[PDB]
Amino acid sequence: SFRIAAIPGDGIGLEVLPEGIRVLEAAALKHGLALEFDTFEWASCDYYLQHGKMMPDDWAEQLKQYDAIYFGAVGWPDKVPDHISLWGSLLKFRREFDQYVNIRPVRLFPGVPCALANRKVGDIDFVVVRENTEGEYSSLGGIMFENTENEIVIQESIFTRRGVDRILKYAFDLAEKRERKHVTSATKSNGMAISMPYWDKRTEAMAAHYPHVSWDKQHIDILCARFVLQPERFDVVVASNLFGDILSDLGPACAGTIGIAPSANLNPERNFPSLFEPVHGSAPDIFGKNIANPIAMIWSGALMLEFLGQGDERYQRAHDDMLNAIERVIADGSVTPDMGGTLSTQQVGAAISDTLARL
Amino acid sequence: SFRIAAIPGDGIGLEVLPEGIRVLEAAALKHGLALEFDTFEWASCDYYLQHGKMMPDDWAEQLKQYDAIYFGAVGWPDKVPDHISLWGSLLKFRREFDQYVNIRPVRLFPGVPCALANRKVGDIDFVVVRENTEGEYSSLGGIMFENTENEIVIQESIFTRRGVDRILKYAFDLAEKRERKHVTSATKSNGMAISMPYWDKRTEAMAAHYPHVSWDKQHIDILCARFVLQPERFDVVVASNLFGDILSDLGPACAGTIGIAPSANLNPERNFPSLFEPVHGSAPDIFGKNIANPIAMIWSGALMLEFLGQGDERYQRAHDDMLNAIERVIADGSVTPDMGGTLSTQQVGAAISDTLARL
């Protein structure tokens, strides 16, 4: 049996998570999987307002008893600053459980109104491999001469050979397994004079060990432009913490909505539990009207089963059936308003769950 | 009589600059303007291979004798590293001439095949105000334990109250003058725990002085998504060095092509000459076939005349005539392949010059 730590967090995380669990429980029944869910109320801004911290001091001790983390979203800027909420919860999960690979697939499904003109199904099908433990996302630095005309703010970005090499290796290994065998590296080696030339140097060094893999590097500005103008060129896109963050909102947007995009925060060595969550945040401006798209949450669940399954064919079939159910519901138009439909969050969850059971 | 330092630089900069000068000379004749062009062969990789530096040591002394700099593009990664070429030339112009405001308009013109579905003229019309002197673009830091497994790379981002306030003031001043009176601030105050919450704090402080201006802040990832999904929402977009760079390729891409996007590197106080250039780079992949879109270069020239004119109204009329001519040529389909046309670089430049004269 697999033990799952379910952590809804803030906002629409509370709306979409139960729909993810619903579909997972339907998948478990169908394929005879043994799954056990425990729900935690912390890693939320409500917990912060009561305790002065996002999580209890022994959070890591508690979560290490679980096989994986199923996570909604964190953040409520009306009550708690965004840097406090994220760094006090999700970023601690990512860094302390060494979940260095952030896998975020981008796909245009049949029946989706595409944001891009003259694009067909097949034109948008790639994976963002995002470095998840270092880089531009930092709490290093500080402020000098605060509250004066001479005020200076410094922010450090750290890249290591260990961290850079391991994300590049994962991306090239992934490309090798895929049909197109192609890696695009996100860079900015003109403007960032130290970090990015180094990233390029390590990319070149890694690409040499993969004779079968075609590779190119693109400055982040023109890469974003190409997501819009020629998304067909991409298969595996490898990027730093910040660049990967940007590309994994932009990609899904080109495919029509951010509401379907899942993410796997993987510790591939399996020394710590991995974390599965939507790309999207807590969406405070739609929380409460139950119109949040639950597909991102559900797809994240499918990725979780695929990762936990390893050698077990039951878990792979459960993943495949969940994707099948998602595809069918989208084709039917049984979707939320962000995809042009009229169904509520709960109705979409129910539709996917029912479709899955009827497969 | 205004003295213009023409610096084509590398690649397609050599192709598009003459087309810019050609249109400027036609505008000069039509409106009785006094323009003198001097071409400089440095700030190029050819110069670097000969002398070991991008520019002569006395470049600043030479250029301070001119009223404005008309710049093509710099970069040739086959022979000179991108960080060396950019930092040794353009970035010195921007920082030593304190050209802290980088103005980058984004517009969907009639007759352009839009990259976005179900979008029409009036849905994409905004301006990116990019901080041009500090922020994430940095050569501060370095490498520790090089060529070992312990290898670390550090890069520092610097923001100052002086620098942050002046760019925000410019953006809010600009919004106040415009019809929609709206500022969107590009941020990432969850991941970047020091620099971006500070940027937000200063934006809040500045916004308080503008009761007529509505303002919102958006995390950079979802902001990029909204450029694709709802570009009609934007009027003035203010951003750091890095975020402004990304958004000023993404915006024009949504509008159909990067080949039309101009940029004005302004020192508003006029202590130093300002620089006018296309957003696009040297495009080594198309250099030689004369298919490069010269409109970005030409539009940049119109912006130059607008800025230089000050009180002289025939310089404003020249800008207006040049934009008029650009619009008519685009509507006629007399355009380069990037806009779906079959004309060469020289034919487009000729078409704009001829149209201008006939107005």
Ligand SMILES: NC(=O)C1=CN([C@@H]2O[C@H](COP(=O)(O)OP(=O)(O)OC[C@H]3O[C@@H](n4cnc5c(N)ncnc54)[C@H](O)[C@@H]3O)[C@@H](O)[C@H]2O)C=CC1
């Ligand atoms: N992994 C995480 O826990 C992340 C947390 N956040 C946090 O979330 C809060 C809001 O940040 P935003 O920049 O607004 O990002 P967001 O992803 O929460 O929302 C951006 C926009 O997309 C829409 N949206 C998001 N998910 C949707 C869904 N499932 N269905 C339909 N529409 C959806 C929202 O309505 C909003 O207009 C902040 O506190 C931020 O720090 C943001 C991104 C990731």
Ligand SMILES: NC(=O)C1=CN([C@@H]2O[C@H](COP(=O)(O)OP(=O)(O)OC[C@H]3O[C@@H](n4cnc5c(N)ncnc54)[C@H](O)[C@@H]3O)[C@@H](O)[C@H]2O)C=CC1
């Ligand atoms: N301000 C400047 O002088 C800048 C210089 N660069 C430099 O330029 C070099 C190439 O960089 P890239 O990332 O390829 O950016 P790029 O802007 O030069 O080209 C990107 C893509 O857009 C196309 N493109 C660019 N301008 C075009 C035009 N006017 N008409 C039709 N197509 C056009 C190119 O063919 C290429 O596929 C690098 O060395 C880089 O450092 C890049 C950006 C700005």
Ligand SMILES: O=C([O-])C(=O)[O-]
């Ligand atoms: O913080 C974010 O926006 C993320 O992880 O996608």
Ligand SMILES: O=C([O-])C(=O)[O-]
């Ligand atoms: O360097 C760049 O890419 C720019 O300034 O647009």
Ligand SMILES: [Mg+2]
């Ligand atoms: Mg994100």
Ligand SMILES: [Mg+2]
């Ligand atoms: Mg750029």
Ligand SMILES: [N+]
């Ligand atoms: N999330």
Ligand SMILES: [N+]
């Ligand atoms: N340029």
